[PDB]
Structures are given as C-alpha cells and as structure tokens.
Amino acid sequence: GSVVGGLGGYMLGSAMSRPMIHFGNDWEDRYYRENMNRYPNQVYYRPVDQYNNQNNFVHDCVNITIKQHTVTTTTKGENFTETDVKMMERVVEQMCVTQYQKESQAYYEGRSS
C-alpha cells in the first residue's frame, strides 16, 4: 500500500555507462567516482512524439529522475546537499540530454514533432 504521487506514464530508455564528465577538480571527480554507485545509471521522461523542445525535456527529466530517487528514500533517512544534488544533476543531465539525442532518433524517423 504505497501509491505514486501521480506520474502520467513516463518511461525509461536504456542504461548506459558513466558519461565522460570533466570537473577539473580532483575532489569533485573523487566525489563522483565514490558516489558512482549511489546515483542512477538511467533517466525517466515522457515520449519524444509528445515533445517540441529539449530545454523543457531536460528540466522535466532531471526533475522526475531525481524525484523518483530523492523523494522516495528521503523518508528512510537519505538527506543530501547541493554538492550531492549537483553531482547527481551533472550525471542525470548529461545522461538525459545525450539519451534524448539518441532515443529521439530511435523514436523519430519522420514525425517532425
């Protein structure tokens, strides 16, 4: 007995490896490589055939992907900070953006949506 807050049938594409991110700080990439096993390897979005812009798509994808992890286990004792939210964001954004550039094509051969 635990319903969801009411997602509208967002779906999940693929799992892909760690994107080639470059922080220029040892402590930053060192936080990433540790928490490499904390963060998701996957991203959640509505279908490309119901979109018309990427900047909206990124915002919603980052929202929902983080939401479905943060505001899921926070209630079990998982509190994080901007450092964590920015680390996961940099991963979730880089995933979901590159994923949209891939998955749109696999969705869309003509649509013009």
PDB file of C-alpha atoms in Angstrom:
ATOM      1  CA  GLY A   1       0.000   0.000   0.000  1.00  0.00           C
ATOM      2  CA  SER A   2       2.221   2.828  -1.335  1.00  0.00           C
ATOM      3  CA  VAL A   3       0.852   4.689  -4.408  1.00  0.00           C
ATOM      4  CA  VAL A   4       2.851   7.179  -6.505  1.00  0.00           C
ATOM      5  CA  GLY A   5       2.126  10.953  -6.419  1.00  0.00           C
ATOM      6  CA  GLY A   6       0.560  10.526  -9.899  1.00  0.00           C
ATOM      7  CA  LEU A   7       3.072  10.214 -12.800  1.00  0.00           C
ATOM      8  CA  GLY A   8       1.420  10.127 -16.242  1.00  0.00           C
ATOM      9  CA  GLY A   9       3.268   7.146 -17.711  1.00  0.00           C
ATOM     10  CA  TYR A  10       6.794   8.497 -18.085  1.00  0.00           C
ATOM     11  CA  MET A  11       9.003   5.661 -19.432  1.00  0.00           C
ATOM     12  CA  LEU A  12      12.678   4.673 -19.072  1.00  0.00           C
ATOM     13  CA  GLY A  13      15.012   4.337 -22.062  1.00  0.00           C
ATOM     14  CA  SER A  14      18.287   2.483 -21.582  1.00  0.00           C
ATOM     15  CA  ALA A  15      21.162   2.121 -19.140  1.00  0.00           C
ATOM     16  CA  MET A  16      24.495   3.469 -20.468  1.00  0.00           C
ATOM     17  CA  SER A  17      27.890   3.785 -18.695  1.00  0.00           C
ATOM     18  CA  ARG A  18      29.386   6.821 -16.859  1.00  0.00           C
ATOM     19  CA  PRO A  19      29.402   9.808 -19.272  1.00  0.00           C
ATOM     20  CA  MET A  20      32.819  11.404 -19.964  1.00  0.00           C
ATOM     21  CA  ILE A  21      32.421  14.277 -17.442  1.00  0.00           C
ATOM     22  CA  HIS A  22      35.396  16.568 -16.640  1.00  0.00           C
ATOM     23  CA  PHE A  23      35.280  18.641 -13.410  1.00  0.00           C
ATOM     24  CA  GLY A  24      38.927  19.887 -13.351  1.00  0.00           C
ATOM     25  CA  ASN A  25      38.926  19.351  -9.538  1.00  0.00           C
ATOM     26  CA  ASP A  26      40.334  16.184  -8.001  1.00  0.00           C
ATOM     27  CA  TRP A  27      37.927  16.349  -5.029  1.00  0.00           C
ATOM     28  CA  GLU A  28      34.938  16.731  -7.424  1.00  0.00           C
ATOM     29  CA  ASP A  29      35.786  13.758  -9.679  1.00  0.00           C
ATOM     30  CA  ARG A  30      36.736  11.880  -6.462  1.00  0.00           C
ATOM     31  CA  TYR A  31      33.239  12.590  -5.060  1.00  0.00           C
ATOM     32  CA  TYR A  32      31.743  11.396  -8.379  1.00  0.00           C
ATOM     33  CA  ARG A  33      33.797   8.133  -8.568  1.00  0.00           C
ATOM     34  CA  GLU A  34      32.850   7.252  -4.956  1.00  0.00           C
ATOM     35  CA  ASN A  35      29.118   8.092  -5.362  1.00  0.00           C
ATOM     36  CA  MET A  36      29.299   6.399  -8.821  1.00  0.00           C
ATOM     37  CA  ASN A  37      27.384   3.538  -7.096  1.00  0.00           C
ATOM     38  CA  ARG A  38      24.921   5.892  -5.274  1.00  0.00           C
ATOM     39  CA  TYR A  39      23.451   7.599  -8.370  1.00  0.00           C
ATOM     40  CA  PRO A  40      21.134   6.060 -11.011  1.00  0.00           C
ATOM     41  CA  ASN A  41      22.505   4.788 -14.353  1.00  0.00           C
ATOM     42  CA  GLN A  42      19.148   5.636 -16.005  1.00  0.00           C
ATOM     43  CA  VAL A  43      16.783   8.549 -16.813  1.00  0.00           C
ATOM     44  CA  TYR A  44      12.952   8.932 -16.937  1.00  0.00           C
ATOM     45  CA  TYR A  45      10.996  11.046 -19.476  1.00  0.00           C
ATOM     46  CA  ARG A  46       7.732  11.333 -21.482  1.00  0.00           C
ATOM     47  CA  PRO A  47       7.837  10.149 -25.127  1.00  0.00           C
ATOM     48  CA  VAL A  48       9.552  12.258 -27.828  1.00  0.00           C
ATOM     49  CA  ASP A  49       6.394  12.076 -30.017  1.00  0.00           C
ATOM     50  CA  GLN A  50       4.670  14.324 -27.408  1.00  0.00           C
ATOM     51  CA  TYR A  51       7.505  16.966 -27.162  1.00  0.00           C
ATOM     52  CA  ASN A  52       8.648  20.020 -29.145  1.00  0.00           C
ATOM     53  CA  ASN A  53      11.715  21.332 -27.129  1.00  0.00           C
ATOM     54  CA  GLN A  54      14.816  19.936 -25.416  1.00  0.00           C
ATOM     55  CA  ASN A  55      15.124  22.636 -22.717  1.00  0.00           C
ATOM     56  CA  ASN A  56      11.724  21.620 -21.320  1.00  0.00           C
ATOM     57  CA  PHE A  57      12.611  17.921 -21.740  1.00  0.00           C
ATOM     58  CA  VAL A  58      15.876  18.349 -19.736  1.00  0.00           C
ATOM     59  CA  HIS A  59      14.121  20.245 -16.911  1.00  0.00           C
ATOM     60  CA  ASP A  60      11.341  17.613 -16.611  1.00  0.00           C
ATOM     61  CA  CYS A  61      13.752  14.650 -16.981  1.00  0.00           C
ATOM     62  CA  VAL A  62      16.180  15.991 -14.332  1.00  0.00           C
ATOM     63  CA  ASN A  63      13.113  16.745 -12.140  1.00  0.00           C
ATOM     64  CA  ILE A  64      11.436  13.310 -12.441  1.00  0.00           C
ATOM     65  CA  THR A  65      14.646  11.205 -12.415  1.00  0.00           C
ATOM     66  CA  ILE A  66      15.955  12.917  -9.248  1.00  0.00           C
ATOM     67  CA  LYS A  67      12.375  12.997  -7.776  1.00  0.00           C
ATOM     68  CA  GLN A  68      11.934   9.219  -8.187  1.00  0.00           C
ATOM     69  CA  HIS A  69      15.127   8.665  -6.142  1.00  0.00           C
ATOM     70  CA  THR A  70      15.419  11.619  -3.684  1.00  0.00           C
ATOM     71  CA  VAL A  71      11.706  11.955  -2.717  1.00  0.00           C
ATOM     72  CA  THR A  72      11.494   8.162  -2.476  1.00  0.00           C
ATOM     73  CA  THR A  73      14.288   7.228   0.005  1.00  0.00           C
ATOM     74  CA  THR A  74      14.467  10.571   1.878  1.00  0.00           C
ATOM     75  CA  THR A  75      11.629   9.086   4.043  1.00  0.00           C
ATOM     76  CA  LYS A  76      14.072   6.226   5.002  1.00  0.00           C
ATOM     77  CA  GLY A  77      16.891   8.562   6.147  1.00  0.00           C
ATOM     78  CA  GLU A  78      18.604   9.786   2.960  1.00  0.00           C
ATOM     79  CA  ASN A  79      19.310  13.514   3.266  1.00  0.00           C
ATOM     80  CA  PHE A  80      21.595  15.191   0.746  1.00  0.00           C
ATOM     81  CA  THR A  81      23.021  18.629  -0.039  1.00  0.00           C
ATOM     82  CA  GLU A  82      23.621  20.857  -3.049  1.00  0.00           C
ATOM     83  CA  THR A  83      27.021  19.125  -3.521  1.00  0.00           C
ATOM     84  CA  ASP A  84      25.158  15.785  -3.902  1.00  0.00           C
ATOM     85  CA  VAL A  85      22.237  17.219  -5.917  1.00  0.00           C
ATOM     86  CA  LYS A  86      24.756  18.919  -8.296  1.00  0.00           C
ATOM     87  CA  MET A  87      26.789  15.699  -8.617  1.00  0.00           C
ATOM     88  CA  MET A  88      23.695  13.648  -9.460  1.00  0.00           C
ATOM     89  CA  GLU A  89      22.366  16.501 -11.643  1.00  0.00           C
ATOM     90  CA  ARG A  90      25.582  16.660 -13.697  1.00  0.00           C
ATOM     91  CA  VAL A  91      25.203  12.902 -14.295  1.00  0.00           C
ATOM     92  CA  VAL A  92      21.347  12.921 -14.834  1.00  0.00           C
ATOM     93  CA  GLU A  93      21.507  15.962 -17.188  1.00  0.00           C
ATOM     94  CA  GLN A  94      24.444  14.511 -19.193  1.00  0.00           C
ATOM     95  CA  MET A  95      22.639  11.173 -19.401  1.00  0.00           C
ATOM     96  CA  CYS A  96      19.187  12.510 -20.249  1.00  0.00           C
ATOM     97  CA  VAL A  97      20.428  15.065 -22.821  1.00  0.00           C
ATOM     98  CA  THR A  98      22.631  12.601 -24.662  1.00  0.00           C
ATOM     99  CA  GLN A  99      19.893   9.971 -24.219  1.00  0.00           C
ATOM    100  CA  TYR A 100      17.297  12.327 -25.852  1.00  0.00           C
ATOM    101  CA  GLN A 101      19.711  12.950 -28.794  1.00  0.00           C
ATOM    102  CA  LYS A 102      19.803   9.111 -29.184  1.00  0.00           C
ATOM    103  CA  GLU A 103      16.274   7.979 -28.218  1.00  0.00           C
ATOM    104  CA  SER A 104      14.533  10.739 -30.239  1.00  0.00           C
ATOM    105  CA  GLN A 105      16.209   9.274 -33.314  1.00  0.00           C
ATOM    106  CA  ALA A 106      15.125   5.738 -32.369  1.00  0.00           C
ATOM    107  CA  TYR A 107      11.550   7.157 -31.865  1.00  0.00           C
ATOM    108  CA  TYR A 108      11.525   9.590 -34.800  1.00  0.00           C
ATOM    109  CA  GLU A 109      12.333   8.930 -38.453  1.00  0.00           C
ATOM    110  CA  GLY A 110       9.709  11.364 -39.840  1.00  0.00           C
ATOM    111  CA  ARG A 111       7.406  12.622 -37.011  1.00  0.00           C
ATOM    112  CA  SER A 112       8.517  16.305 -37.103  1.00  0.00           C
ATOM    113  CA  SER A 113       7.237  16.568 -33.561  1.00  0.00           C
TER     114      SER A 113
END
